[PDB]
Amino acid sequence: KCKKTTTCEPLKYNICLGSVLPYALTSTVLAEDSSSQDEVHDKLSLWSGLRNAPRCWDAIRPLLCAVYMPKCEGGKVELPSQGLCQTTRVPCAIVARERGWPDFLKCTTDYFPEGCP
């Protein structure tokens, strides 16, 4: 429940929304709106409109990077935590009003499990 088996690929984009990525491989399996690293970049580019809402941006950046550009190692990615997802619900409430959170970014425990290291 804490990890997902998947195939790892070398990172094509070395930075996630300004944040450095201290690992070599990733997977697009958690971002259900994205089937390639190029598409991941284009979806993150859309999300980047939230840079104009800094309180949300500060909360949502680690969530987006954990989902869109996760560390992949030995054919597995770690799922983001329930806690990390919950931190975004109030400062990024505008997302829910403007369009709605995609299902893979709603804090259900199948996508964001509890009690994992």
Ligand X SMILES: CC(C)CCC[C@](C)(O)[C@H]1CC[C@H]2[C@@H]3CC=C4C[C@@H](O)CC[C@]4(C)[C@H]3CC[C@@]21C
Q: Cβ distance 105 to 67 under 8 Å? A: yes
Partners of 76 in the β-ladder: 5, 73
- The residue (of 13 and 47) whose beta carbon lies closer to ligand X is 47
103 is in an annotated binding site: yes
Q: What angle do CA 104, 29, 15 make, to 5 degrees?
A: 95
**Of 20, 46, 74, 117, the one binding ligand X by CB under 6 A:** 46
Going by C-alpha positions, the residue among 2, 73, 81, 70 that lies closest to residue 30 is 70
Minimum distance, C-beta of residue 75 to ligand X, in the bound complex (Å):
26
With binding defined as CB under 6 A, does residue 94 bind ligand X? Answer: yes
Minimum distance, C-beta of residue 16 to ligand X, in the bound complex (Å):
15
33 is in an annotated binding site: no
- Please give the residues from 50 up to 69 whose contact with ligand X meets the rule CB under 6 A: 50, 52-53
* Alpha-carbon gap, residue 117 to 89, rounded angstroms: 22
* Alpha-carbon gap, residue 41 to 11, rounded angstroms: 11
The footprint of ligand X (CB under 6 A) covers 33, 43, 46-47, 49-50, 52-53, 94-95, 98-99, 102
